[PDB]
Amino acid sequence: GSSGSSGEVQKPLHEQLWYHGAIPRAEVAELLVHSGDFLVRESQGKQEYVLSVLWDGLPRHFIIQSLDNLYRLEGEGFPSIPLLIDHLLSTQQPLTKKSGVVLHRAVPSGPSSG
């Protein structure tokens, strides 16, 4: 029974734990070990994030949401990615109708982004 709890919802994105930064697609599966491990990464120099999450022994890659000035994945949108994560993580909501991934575990990387 010895691990941290979840948290950091109301923190900025720049003080998350799962926000690794600019990482390649291969590094994902080196970091994720548990079905439910996720991180958020940046693309190949595009201002566009990707959610990278291990499900059924396969590190899925979904571009982070963006509609307006929000992020929306199942239901409504939120002003921050980390705010949306919590309302997925505590609810176990499916990331897409096409793979039924749900958030469980957050790979820590520390707060020092790049």
CATH at residue 14: 3.30.505.10
- The count of structural domains within the chain is 1
Output the CA–CA distances (angstroms, integers) from residue 101 to 1, 7, 19, in the order listed.
Answer: 25, 20, 18
| Domain residue limits at 103 | 1-114
CA neighbours closer than 13 Å in the CB half-sphere of residue 93:
15
CA 19, chain centre distance (Å): 7
What was the structure determination method? NMR
User: What single string gives the DSSP state of each residue in the chain?
Assistant: --S-----TTS-GGG-SSEEEE--HHHHHHH--STTEEEEEE-SSSS-EEEEEEETTEEEEEEPP-SSSSEESSS-EESSHHHHHHHHHTTT-BS-TTT--B--EE----S---
What backbone phi and psi angles, to 5 degrees, belong to 88?
-95, -45
Neighbours of 58 (CB within 10 A): 13
